[PDB]
């Protein structure tokens, strides 16, 4: 349960380091810092305005940006579901 | 568990093939080719701007478009919940 | 499990009959028919643009509209969670 | 199960009292009084337009506003998941 929470934090950093590098120069408001990126990657992870607000505008410059976001969305959604079930196990 | 993941992929393709055909000519940005559709159907599946952003604009041209989207939303939401429970079973 | 699915359909109709009556004349695009209402109440139920898109604009005319929507959101979210768990029970 | 529902209500009030104080004067439409805040904190809790619609505009004035919202989002999401599992326990 704690192993999952640690793994996510690790993944989230590598993701926000990568996103900064890839989209930072072109999209400074969302990916211009490691911190600006950590926030957007959290916003995308909760799914709030992920596509119409972030992904679609990013793709008008980087047409393959979906290769980054869609997996990140699937990965974090699986990690969160795995973390959600881990709490249920601790009960039973 | 793997059977569900395979079934969804099958359904998602038939859905994106259909969506391309039905709304492609009229809504090229979201359903203009097979991939454009696959992305929009994923966006609709995560629920991000599904109605105000996609479905409502599509219905101003195709007033019965809801017969396609609403079931797709219910189907994928059930398939995902079924896939979510399948992972819980593998634990126990 | 089937009892819950039946109860929701009943509730959804009474809700969409009520919403039509209350907000129909003032908000014809979202609540001007029983069908227009069934769609908005589904969109609100999935949570897509529920507040910034629907509830907040409705409250600029009907300032107590939240007494209708917030409970409907809580009720349907509980009914859906109850329906979600009912499927898990059928497995075990 | 009832203990969780009580705890959330307590937390939600302290959060809405705080939000009113912190962002009230600057953002009167969303945090202008205790109720305006209670509604916005519920809207943020369901995740509807939490970032692009609320948090990002608030940060253009209060750049550390994320220290309030992101934890509130994580806290309520955990409290709700804990409340969701509590209902499953009552079945079994
Ligand atoms: C796990 C999720 C962690 C999220 C952390 C976000 C931190 C954001 C931050 O440090 N900012 C600068 C605050 O000065 C806000 C920026 O997003 C803008 O400036
Ligand atoms: C399961 C979900 C799979 C989603 C795949 C989307 C692929 C999108 C794609 O190939 N694009 C063209 C990239 O050149 C982006 C378009 O959506 C614009
Ligand atoms: C459970 C959810 C059921 C949702 C049913 C929606 C039916 C909508 C409908 O019948 N329309 C008219 C189609 O002609 C679309 C309207 O929302 C606009 O016109
Ligand atoms: C738990 C969530 C409780 C939410 C309660 C919201 C109450 C809102 C309210 O009292 N308003 C004034 C009604 O006159 C509406 C304002 O948000 C505008
Ligand atoms: Na959501």
From TrEMBL, chains A, B, C, D:
GO cellular component, one term: voltage-gated sodium channel complex
Full-protein interval shown: 131 to 222 of 274
Repeat in keyword set: no
Lineage of the organism: Bacteria, Pseudomonadati, Pseudomonadota, Magnetococcia, Magnetococcales
Protein name: Ion transport protein
TM region positions: 65-89
Localization terms from the record: Membrane
UniProt keyword list: Membrane, Transmembrane, Transmembrane helix
Domain of life: Bacteria
Entry's Gene Ontology molecular function annotations: voltage-gated sodium channel activity
